[PDB]
Amino acid sequence: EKLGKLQYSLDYDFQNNQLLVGIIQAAELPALDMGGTSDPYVKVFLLPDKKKKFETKVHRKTLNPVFNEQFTFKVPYSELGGKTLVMAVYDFDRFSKHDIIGEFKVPMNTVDFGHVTEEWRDLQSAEK
Template sequence: MQFGEELGKIQFSLMYDFPDQTLVLRIVKANHLPAKDFSGTSDPFVKIMLLPDKKVKMETKVKRKNLNPIWNESFHFEGYPYSKIQERVLHLQVLDYDRFSRNDPIGEINLPLAEIDLTHEKLYWRSLTPSKKSSGKLGSLLISLCYAPTAGRITITVLKCQNLAAKDITGKSDPYVKIWHMHKDKRVEKKKTVIKYHTLNPVYNESFVFNIPLDRIRDTTFVVSVLDKDRLSKNDMIGGILLGARTSPAEMSHWNEMMSKPRTNIAKWHVLKGVN
């Protein structure tokens, strides 16, 4: 399944200080990172290693709610003879900081230092590639959007979910989907699907109609959450997405396609994001 979401780029500089036998790395910034949080943004930081040495890990500061973070932080790997540096691979992983659960990987690069001229400081831009174990750990949601401008109506059809994170002790979940219609960040209306019991791959095929005049559409968003029904305690959030004109790239492109093809059902898969 291809979701086609760009992971952004990272800028950094490298040089080797020969007298001090030290590799100097400067993490400058990242651009166009994808939103990993429910709010449509991310809290990125960079984890640094010289593979295969996994014991020495360094990290930048966390930049809150920023998809184009600027760090300008320097890191020194001291006591590495040049011959040893030539055998190392620089590993940079960009993660979204999460206070309540595991940090969510955004993307990474692996750069063999033997391929780099380290005799003077040089700036590099590199595109991030998917981190191992990162894609879709909460599962994904197939949803269809249809806009009828003359009627001032949006129909959202919740089709199905795939590979949802298990929330029950049995290794399953009892998932349902909740949709909040928001206007200018105020809750307007809530709709819910039925609950599907003991499954991580529920099929719903349920449609919900929302009346939205054209002049309100720019300030309209939908918070779509997948939850695990729990009889004894608060329902567990599995993950969610935000649909609207000002959301993250994958969700926004789905919304824009709906707007450009009125009265047509546009179905797309979305990777669920954690709720911060």
């Protein structure tokens, strides 16, 4: 399963108790619409916790769009240990059944929020 790559820089807030999921952009995304492109938008979801749901701005016909949306991981740093965040990129062809071109996730407990977690996250077409 492959969804390309997504660059991001995640930082933590100890005042309001939220992690700042600042992604840069996604590169090399699968096509859905007829034309070799899609309307991929990242829908930030969470495990059982489910205490957060944000919809990014639809990116009409683009497999390498940039925007850098601000996702607020509503959950105390102390709680993050038991919360696995999941970033799924949803399409918005606007005709057929919008499919999940791909997604990515990481065990927050293993994400030592020392300062800022910046890295070139790999994207996978996990049909979940």
